Amino acid sequence: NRPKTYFCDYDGCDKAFTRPSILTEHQLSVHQGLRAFQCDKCAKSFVKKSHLERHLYTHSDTKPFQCSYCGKGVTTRQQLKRHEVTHTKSFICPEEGCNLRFYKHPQL
């Protein structure tokens, strides 16, 4: 919506941003080499609250997305969708007019 009208000034940086706090998040993270959210359970650190929140689940068994078929736990919707698509007849015969459909790619 609103136009990108805050330009990073550093040598060899191309980026422009919508609102000045975001330009500052970029500058402190990329160019100065500082981060604002530390893991309690390992050495790593993160640039956003949502990124530390994802990393915190990785230290735990009670992972926040749970499979509808097998009940395996995962941390975000992309992982869930890819995993659940393995519980489907995903693959299709690529050859002309052939009707068949398959569950594991080596079968196809």
Binding site: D9, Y10, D11, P20, L23, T24, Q27, L28
Partner: peptide, 17 residues
């Protein structure tokens, strides 16, 4: 490290918070 060695003073204040 700024492009062409120039930086706006208001923008420099904004970077260092």
């Amino acid at each position: 490290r700024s492009k062409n060695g120039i930086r706006q003073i208001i923008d420099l204040k904004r970077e260092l918070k």
